[PDB]
Each structure stands twice: as structure tokens, then as C-alpha cells.
Design a protein around this ligand. Sequence first.
Ligand code: PUJ
Ligand code: CA
Ligand code: CA
Ligand code: CA
Ligand code: CA
Ligand code: CL
Length: 464
Amino acid sequence: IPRLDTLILVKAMGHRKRFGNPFRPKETFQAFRTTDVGRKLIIDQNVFIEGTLPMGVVRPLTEVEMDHYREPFLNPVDREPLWRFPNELPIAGEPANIVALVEEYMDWLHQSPVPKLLFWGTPGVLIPPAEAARLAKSLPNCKAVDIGPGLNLLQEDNPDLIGSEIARWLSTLEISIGTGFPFDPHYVEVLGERMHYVDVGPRDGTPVLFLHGNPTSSYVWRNIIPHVAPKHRCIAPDLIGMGKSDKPDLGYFFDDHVRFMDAFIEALGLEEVVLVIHDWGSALGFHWAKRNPERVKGIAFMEFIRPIPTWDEWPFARDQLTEEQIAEFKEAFSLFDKDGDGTITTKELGTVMRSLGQNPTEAELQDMINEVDADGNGTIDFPEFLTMMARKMKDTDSEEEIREAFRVFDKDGNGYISAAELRHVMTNLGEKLTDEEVDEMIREADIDGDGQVNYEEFVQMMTA
Ligand SMILES: CCCCCCOCCOCCNC(=O)c1ccc(C(=O)O)c(C2=C3C=CC(=[N+]4CC(F)C4)C=C3[Si](C)(C)c3cc(N4CC(F)C4)ccc32)c1
Ligand SMILES: [Ca+2]
Ligand SMILES: [Ca+2]
Ligand SMILES: [Ca+2]
Ligand SMILES: [Ca+2]
Ligand SMILES: [Cl-]
């Protein structure tokens, strides 16, 4: 005798007219990180440049801008860094090496006196406003500046404020929207390759080194550097494999970029520097700062890498069901609440359970309610129903959960879902499938072609 949530899942499968997980959220960075899929998206279809990048800017990028970002990646074979980077992000404790190194620099950062300037935007991507506020407290000598609306490339939403702020914070330290890229291209020899960098401003003094992330280049700093360059040397390199730098055949792991950026800094002869860093540029910068803390006179940062403990969070899912989701959940609630009073009782659950062929006792039905009732009055109202389904939607994925869903379809328990069973189960859960839809739902899953759906075949649809 199943859980209520299992019946709502089975109902949502018949609403889609297909076997398979009906709630899978698309998710997106998870696909970037799954073998074969991620590569088809970022390498073959260029999704990181064409979808992801524009979605990191509140204002629309103009075509002229899009073309600057696209340029290094025109050839599909040159896209390895775009795909390796998101597979290096420290999420849910993986990869372990990058999580460790990132935690060690965040620790160093919490104990370091180095002056800090944190830019943040609403709603952010890597650094939600709640996280921005917590850091502006906990990190020493940290000034936080609100840029207004902002996702990831805060530079592209409010360059004038970021630039002017950096120019101001720079004079408090002890140290000596355009689409064009004026800057003269410089190159330097690094580990047998040539890396491109912008190098403007006076020759003397403490330089300001700007570090971009994925999928950008020194281009992202174009409207910030003119605020700083009157007073300080501005060095803005293009990461190896990126912008106008050479593209050796590398796997483009964080540790490759660590080596190229260390050798960049040494090939320039740089001593003490101010860092201005963003996204993977922030991981490089902070990791370098931790290793060379006497050489760093200040860090300005934004939208930086920190460990993201779980996939359930303010970048990768919201806590906010859509309106269509609520409406579909309202129809599911109505199937149970047959009298329309807004509460599901044991009798009502018994009515549905007897219509599916089963014969639950009172105590079984009470317990089915005890699984969902969040206040103790012994009936289910729609907000508890939605609580139940918000959770069901994250993991329809157990194995136990899959077997339990299979059981509701396989009404006689013989290990096969027949066409007759499908129609009876869908009708009694209020889905009204035509013959062509029933045959087609079965046909999609029925790999051996016996007209039935066995366990292995159902598991294959549910985990695809
Ligand atoms: C270090 C980390 C920093 C990174 C900074 C940015 O991160 C912040 C945002 O992160 C969320 C990322 N979120 C997505 O990438 C996303 C999600 C959903 C979709 C979707 O399918 O709707 C999209 C999306 C597109 C989305 C927007 C597009 N424009 C808006 C511009 F005008 C062009 C284009 C595509 Si599209 C036509 C090239 C595209 C194609 C696509 N394919 C599946 C396969 F059949 C081809 C899938 C999704 C899209 C993309
Ligand atoms: Ca009722
Ligand atoms: Ca209740
Ligand atoms: Ca059966
Ligand atoms: Ca079969
Ligand atoms: Cl990334």
C-alpha cells in the first residue's frame, strides 16, 4: 500500500503521457558535469557561450559584445576550457582537490589582514546577497559595495560603479557601457606558450592585476580598467586557452591554470600587486595570495569561487515551485479531495485506494496521512501536499521509490505493466489517455517489444 507521493508521481507520469521521471528539473550545471552530455552541450553546441554567458548578465549583451566573447571559441576544438571549468567547480564536495584548495584559501582569507573590497549584486549567481553580507562581516578589513542588479558578470551590469570604487579604494591603500577594446595587445612567453595581456597605466608603482574567469577574457575588464589606469599600472591577462592567448593541448584543469598564472606573474617580474578578481580568476588569485601573502597589498573581488555545499541552492535550483507546477499539484490534490472541501481525509484516500484495486485498513490510511500531515489534525491540506511534493520532486530517484512506483502501475503484481493495467491505473488517478497515447507510452519503454513494461524497462525510463 503506497505512499501518497508515489501516487502523485504516477499521476504526473500519465499527465505527461510517458514513462520516466516527470519532475526532472533540467538543472543545467549538472548536465555540464555529466559525462558525454556536458561535452555535447558546451563543446559541440557551444551552450556556455550562447546560453550561459548571456544568462550571467542582467542587461542584454549586444551583438558586438557577444562577438568579442565568441571569438576565441569559434572552432569547436578550442572549447576544452569552457567545459573543464564547470567540471572543476567545487559543488557538493566534488572535485575533492578543488574543494580542499578553495577551503584553504577561504580560511587564509578569514585570518588575513589584507584589505578587501567585495562587490556583489542581486540576485547574484555564485555569491547571493545573503552570502555577500555574511562575508562583509566575517572577513577582516572588508568593504562591500552593492552594484544593484547583477548575476555573474557584474562588470557588464555596472562597470562605472565597480571601476570608480576600485579607484577610490586604491588610494586608501599603502602602495605607490562601451563595447570597444582599445588596448594594445602584449604577449609574454609562459611555459613555452604566449599569453596575451593588457598592460596600461604608469610603469612605476604597485600594479593592479585583473583576473577573469569562465567564459570570458580580459575583455570583461574593458570598462573597469580606464578608471584605474590614470593612477596605477593595470595588467589584465587572458588565461591560457582563453581570449587571445595560445591554446596548447591541455586538459585545462585548475592546476594547469595555476601553473600558467604563476609563470605569468614571474615572467612579468611582478613583486607586490593588488588583485582584482572574478569567478575562476578569483580562485587563481586567492590561491596565489595564500601562497604569496607578503606580495598582496589588496584584493578586490566579486562573484568568486567558494565551496557550494549542495546542489539544492540559490545558483542551481530555487525554493519556489512554478505556477504551472502548483496548478498541476492542485489538480492532483483534487483527485483526492473529491468533495472539494480543501482537506483530504482517510475516507477519501480509501476511495482512491479501493478504486486502484487495493483494500487498505483504517490504520493503513491513517498512516498514509501521518506521512504527510504536518500539524497533527489528521487530514491533509494543500500546503502540506505541496510540502510533500517539493520534497518528492528532488529525489524520485531511490530505487525503493522506483519499485514502489512500478508496483502501482503493475496492479496484479506479476512484474509486467500491461496496457490494461495502465489504463485502469491512469483513469483512477484522473488521467484520460486515448488508445494511441497508451500504446505510445508503452511502446517508448518496451524495449523487448512484448507490448508490456517490465521492471528493467521501467527502471531504464526512470533513470535515463
Ligand atoms: C563560474 C560560473 C559563472 C557562469 C556565469 C553564468 O552563470 C549564471 C547562469 O547560470 C545558469 C546557466 N543556465 C544555462 O546555461 C541555460 C539554462 C536554460 C536554458 C534553456 O534551455 O532555456 C539555456 C539555453 C539558452 C538560454 C538562453 C539563451 N539566450 C538568452 C540570449 F539572448 C541567448 C540561449 C540558450 Si541556447 C538556444 C544556446 C540553449 C540550448 C540548449 N540545448 C539543449 C540542446 F538541445 C541545445 C539548452 C539550453 C539553452 C541555458
Ligand atoms: Ca475532502
Ligand atoms: Ca493536517
Ligand atoms: Ca501486471
Ligand atoms: Ca517489454
Ligand atoms: Cl565555470
